[PDB]
Design a protein around this nucleic acid. Structure first.
Lengths: 225, 394, 333, 126
RNA sequence: UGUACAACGGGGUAUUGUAAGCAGUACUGCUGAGAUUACCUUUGUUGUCUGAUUUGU
RNA sequence: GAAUGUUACCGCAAUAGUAAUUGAACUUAGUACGAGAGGAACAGUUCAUUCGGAUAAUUGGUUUGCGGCUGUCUGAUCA
RNA sequence: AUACCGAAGCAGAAUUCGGUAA
RNA sequence: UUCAUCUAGACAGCCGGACGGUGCCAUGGAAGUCGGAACCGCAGGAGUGUGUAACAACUCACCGGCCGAAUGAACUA
């Protein structure tokens, strides 16, 4: 199920795109190799929204959401928000967030059930996420790193944590989040597994440098096969 | 260092080396001669250093590499040429230091060249040997000792040539004669998500090739898969093959040995005399037996809220060769711009061109723009009309 | 310093002499090879970058654009040329029967003192069956090879105290020089608009005299590869009638153009700046040939236009912005 | 256009959890034809700095450092001209593998886009 | 000898944030005030519009 | 700025000064090559540095004009 | 000052040599 | 200028013969042509190169069908 790609000869697959069980978000540019994989695996079953966030190419790290909706940070421009509302169907909501930090993908790890956020999240924003996404919000400290989303990736079926995550943390979180967790790497040992790949409950994409053992571990832990 | 070798610089013996510097280089007269000496000597020293550094030494690398070089080229000559080059460099330095230490001045510069030529030209034979060995050492395969490896030995062309070809990517001639594969062959295949390398050798029938193969087998940890035939390929009898296998007996048992074989089945009991070897039938022109052998060799070497899946998600079948096709039809991807209109899910088919004024001559339109503000339009407007009964300007 | 742009001796006139034309297309319909106008101040414009692969691709980007005060071009005559071994030569010159006071002033410095005996007896020759002034057309047709139209600008429309007309020769794109002269004669005393020659997104070039610093400056210069973003019509109103910013205003900055240039006639928007300052007459040309690059071929839209005055630092955009926050202003209301 | 503001050796602040406190820009890369006039660092520029206060590994050894903030007002093609808290930087290898597991403070959009991994390690943008 | 030249205050433009006083509750409403404004503007009024020299196949 | 007709406008050009310059990203690439790591390439696109001309959209070292601050004081706050 | 040709067991990367040229 | 060929067929150029005993050491293949040491039976080297693991196949030098007279090598200036 997992795909292989190299966006503009790069390796951060998840930085320039975000994906969920109901919609897909990708960056814009000139290269079509990255956009090819999404069509290959899904064709057009879900909206492959070619869009940017706050004028940045780091759309994947700047957006957080699940199947129930999507939300964008403060820096998103009025044109960006309007065209996003005109890109998503009425069945999917859109939200704006006001706070000092902006990188939702780096600040918040979002799945279909429970949302993991930076510990310093404000109460207003902490409560806001639950309503639109319909998920619980609990502050997380995976791997003892304050920026949980900067490197981590957690699909609904499991969780691929960065190699810096301790075994004790994985054991504690596996029985608490009700999902399996395994420590691994991507892009031939890259520690930032949250940037080099995107994974959900049926689809996965990895960089060209990704080795076979990493792909097999990702497939098995998330129950793709 | 690198298992293979190719970066070694080339050497042009005799006139070429002299010219490379002569053409490059070609009481103020004394100063000019001093400058010329300070350039010719430096150029010669740089050339000698490049020759020395580039060419690896026989005994300075892994002992396996030392043995491989010994069995390929002349052991003594390899060091003799290096010693001669070092002596030539020392003599060049001595000549330069000697100079460092009209009619009459004209002859000052001649001696420098007259003696540099004497020092250099005599090195043609060592330089010729260096150039000869350079070509042979610049194409050595990746005979990595660390990675798991398997070897095959036996009488030449008993079907062995096609075994490596059918076990891994390789091109080996199957023409029957003494040694069709004059040199080593290397093939790479992946198993258990880790690299495995297959290497082959003509065999053992002395000669330099025989010693090379024997030393390569002994030094390396690679297992040896002796080759035989249930039929009579090559024309040699079973007894000769058994004797040849016994010839390799003294040093092969410590490599986890196996035997591959293409009244006939009874005479093979002599091969089984060694408890360490395992024998099974196979064939070189089919895949199942060679793959079984490969799997067995790899095995031997190994010891040395609920999930959400929409129906539409699983309804579509994976495409079998895309954005590549669309942009290729559009005349290119990088040269073509991205398109938004008519692609993204428009809110409605009517207002296909929402143009957002985004300007109020002092503030952004979105500072208060909102939909369905009709109710507020019928309430706020009264503030600008009720001035008759008050007048805020006062 | 540039070797080609030496010596730095100043130009001999405000108008920059054009000495090159875009070859001679014998197949294109009759059209003007260049245009004439006046330079105003400068403004700011933003547009969507459709260039593929750019860092700001498919994003709004701000670009500096100047404004050229373009008065209507009224034809006053035409000039024919014949090839000779001694170079191009003007065999005959003709005029459009009548000449305005501004055109007549071009031949006079002490116009008020002079008896105003400008083009007059020449009109008397025209004031008949034609004869010579009609046989000149046949003479041009017989021998002429390239024909250059003679036009002047409506200076009195431009807010310039100097009412003297500015005139220059413009080559005709179309071939069949008979058609060249026929069209020129038919266009005698007619008014030509910008749309009749130039068009949006065209890569025009600008030539004018550089600013004088008060010898540095005040020398002729040629700038090429400048793309037009919008044909401007200042005779009408709501020049900012773009697809965006539906609060129509005028390109004129608050309080008028700084120093000079209160637009009261046609204008054009050109990418980047133009050599020379305002009050300087500038000639426009099609830049010989059109580059096929995206930066030269792509078409662009327009959006925000800056309207704040520069008589200081700049703040207010429109006079209606002054309310609410200032409370009471008894001096005014 | 790259300006000539911050010169070599600027003791800019450090905004990473790697334990560094300041970054002395001893060496700046990309100094080619810009002769006579000394080079200068900029947002997302390839420059190297030595941590003035820290362990010996970061003293006398030059390693690349990525600047995420500049404080000084900078022009943008988008039309914005604002500025924020202060200049800051991070220590990373030439390929952008920042050692620090976390980054604090805003990160300029100019450098975030051109350094996907640096942006991924930062939460605050602009 | 026609809004041709030029003065003006006005109008826009730029600038400042509580000015002269008066309402006394030991700074409060006029009061983001008055204000200048060598940039544009010259709408009405008002003043000027006539001199010496030279040239001419 | 001196002279050949007086004056002025639009033109031609004998002639002379020559101008550009380097790196980076996509797509052709993980392609040909190749046991293997590693990695071509034309052409089509996107940027900045060295140098040259420009103008002020913005920035920048750069009308005691508007708010008040000190002294000699008109008597006394307004100056 | 940069590049253009022919050669090297120059597979690719990469390197050297004889000519043009500053 | 010296020597040579002389319609017994000058020189260039096409097609053929280019064989036999047959060879030993390198043994792994080497038989003319990777490297050891130098006959002759009847126009033909136990071999000038190409090339194959080597035979294989072409070949030049030597001749033959061949063409119809100047010609090949070095010197003097």
């Amino acid at each position: 199920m997992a795909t292989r790609t190299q966006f503009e000869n790069s390796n951060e697959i998840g930085v320039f795109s975000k994906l969920t069980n109901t919609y897909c978000l990708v960056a814009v540019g000139g290269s079509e190799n990255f956009y090819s994989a999404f069509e290959a695996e899904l064709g057009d079953a879900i909206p492959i929204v070619h869009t940017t966030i706050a004028g940045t190419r780091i759309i994947g790290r700047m957006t957080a959401g699940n199947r129930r909706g999507l939300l964008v940070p403060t820096q998103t421009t009025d044109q960006e928000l309007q065209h996003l509302r005109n890109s998503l169907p009425d069945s999917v909501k859109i939200q704006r967030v006001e706070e000092r930090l902006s990188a939702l993908g780096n600040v918040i790890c979002c799945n279909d059930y429970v949302a993991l956020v930076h510990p310093d999240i404000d109460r207003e924003t902490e409560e806001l996420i639950s309503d639109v996404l319909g998920v619980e919000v609990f502050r997380q400290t995976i791997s003892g790193n304050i920026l949980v989303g900067s490197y981590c990736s957690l699909s609904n079926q499991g969780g691929l944590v960065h190699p810096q995550t301790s075994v004790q943390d994985q054991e504690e979180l596996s029985s608490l989040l009700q999902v399996p967790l395994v420590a691994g790497t991507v892009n031939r040992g890259s520690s930032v597994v949250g940037a080099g790949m995107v994974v959900n409950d049926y689809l996965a994409v990895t960089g060209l440098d990704t080795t076979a053992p990493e792909l097999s571990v990702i497939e098995s832990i998330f129950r793709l096969q | 260092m690198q298992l293979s070798w190719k970066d070694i610089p080339t050497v042009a013996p005799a006139n070429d080396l002299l010219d490379i510097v002569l053409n490059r280089t070609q009481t103020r007269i004394r100063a000019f001669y001093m400058r010329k000496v300070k350039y010719t000597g430096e150029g010669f020293v740089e050339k000698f250093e490049d020759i020395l550094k580039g060419f690896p030494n026989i005994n300075d690398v892994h002992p396996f590499h030392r043995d491989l070089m010994d069995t390929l080229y002349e052991k003594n000559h390899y060091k003799i040429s290096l010693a001669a080059i070092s002596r030539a460099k020392s003599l060049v330095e001595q000549v330069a230091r000697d100079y460092v230490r009209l009619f009459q001045c004209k002859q000052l510069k001649r001696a420098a060249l007259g003696r540099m030529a004497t020092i250099v030209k005599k090195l043609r034979d060592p330089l010729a040997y260096l150039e000869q060995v350079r070509q042979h050492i610049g194409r050595l395969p990746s005979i990595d000792p660390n990675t798991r490896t398997l070897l095959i030995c036996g009488y030449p062309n008993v079907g062995k040539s096609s075994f490596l070809r059918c076990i891994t990517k390789s091109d080996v001639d199957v023409q029957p004669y003494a040694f069709t594969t004059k040199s080593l062959y290397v093939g790479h295949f992946d198993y258990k998500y880790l690299r495995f390398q297959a290497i082959d050798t003509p065999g053992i029938l002395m000669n330099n090739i025989e010693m090379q193969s024997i030393y390569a087998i002994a030094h390396l940890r690679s297992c040896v898969l002796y080759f035989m035939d249930l039929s009579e390929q090559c024309g040699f009898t079973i007894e000769a093959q058994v004797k040849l296998f016994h010839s390799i007996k003294p040093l092969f048992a410590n490599k986890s040995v196996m035997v591959v074989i293409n009244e006939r089945a009874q005479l093979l009991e002599s091969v089984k005399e060694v408890p360490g070897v395992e024998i099974m039938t196979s064939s070189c022109q089919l895949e199942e037996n060679v793959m079984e052998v490969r799997n067995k060799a790899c095995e031997k070497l190994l010891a040395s809220r609920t999930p959400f899946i929409p129906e539409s998600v699983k309804n579509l079948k994976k495409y079998d060769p895309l954005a590549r096709d669309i942009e290729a039809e559009n005349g290119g991807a990088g040269v073509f711009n991205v398109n938004l209109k008519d692609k993204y899910l428009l809110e409605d088919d009517e207002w296909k061109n929402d143009i957002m004024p985004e300007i109020l001559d002092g503030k952004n339109v979105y500072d208060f723009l909102d939909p369905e503000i009709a109710a507020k339009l019928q309430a706020l407007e009264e503030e600008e009309e009720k001035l008759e009964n008050e007048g805020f300007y006062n | 310093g540039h070797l080609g742009f030496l010596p730095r001796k100043r130009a001999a006139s405000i108008r920059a002499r054009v000495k090159a034309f875009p070859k001679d297309d014998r197949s294109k319909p009759v059209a003007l090879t260049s245009f004439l106008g006046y330079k105003a101040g400068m403004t700011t414009i933003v547009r969507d970058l459709d260039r593929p692969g750019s860092k700001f691709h498919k994003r709004e980007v701000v670009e500096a654009v100047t404004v050229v005060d373009t008065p209507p071009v009224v034809v006053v005559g035409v000039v024919g040329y014949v090839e000779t071994p001694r170079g191009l030569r003007s065999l005959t010159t003709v005029w459009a029967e009548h000449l305005s006071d501004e055109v007549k002033r071009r031949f006079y410095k002490n116009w008020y003192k002079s008896k105003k005996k400008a083009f007059t007896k020449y009109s008397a020759k025209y004031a008949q069956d034609g004869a010579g002034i009609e046989r000149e057309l046949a003479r041009i047709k017989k021998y002429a090879s390239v024909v250059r139209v003679l036009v002047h600008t409506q200076i009195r429309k431009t807010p310039l105290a100097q009412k003297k007309a500015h005139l220059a020769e413009i080559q005709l794109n179309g071939g069949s020089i008979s058609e060249k002269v026929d069209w020129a004669r038919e266009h005698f005393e007619k008014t030509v608009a910008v749309d009749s020659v130039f068009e949006q997104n065209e890569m025009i070039d600008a030539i004018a005299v550089t600013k004088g610093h008060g010898q540095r400056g005040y020398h002729s210069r040629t700038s090429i590869n400048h793309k037009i973003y919008r044909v401007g019509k200042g005779d009408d109103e709501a020049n900012g009638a773009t697809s965006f910013d539906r609060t129509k205003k005028t390109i004129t900055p608050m309080g008028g153009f700084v120093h000079y240039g209160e637009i009261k006639n046609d204008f054009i928007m050109v990418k980047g700046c133009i050599p020379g300052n305002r009050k300087r007459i500038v000639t426009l040309r099609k830049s010989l040939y059109t580059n096929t690059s995206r930066k030269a071929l792509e078409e662009v839209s327009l959006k925000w236009i800056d309207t704040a005055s520069k008589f200081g630092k700049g703040r207010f955009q429109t006079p209606a912005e002054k309310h609410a926050f200032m409370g009471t202003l008894k001096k005014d209301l | 256009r790259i300006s000539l503001g911050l010169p070599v050796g600027a003791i800019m602040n450090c905004a990473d959890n790697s334990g560094a406190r300041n970054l002395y820009i001893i060496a700046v890369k990309g100094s080619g034809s810009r002769l006579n006039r000394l080079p200068a660092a900029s947002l997302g520029d390839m420059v190297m700095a030595t941590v003035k206060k820290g362990k010996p590994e970061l003293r006398k050894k030059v390693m690349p450092a990525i600047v995420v903030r500049q404080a000084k007002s900078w022009r943008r093609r988008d039309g914005v001209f604002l500025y924020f808290e202060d200049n800051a930087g991070v220590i990373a290898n030439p390929k952008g593998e920042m050692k620090g597991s976390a980054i604090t403070g805003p990160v300029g959009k100019e450098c975030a886009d051109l350094w996907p991994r640096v942006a991924s390690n930062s939460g605050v943008v602009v």
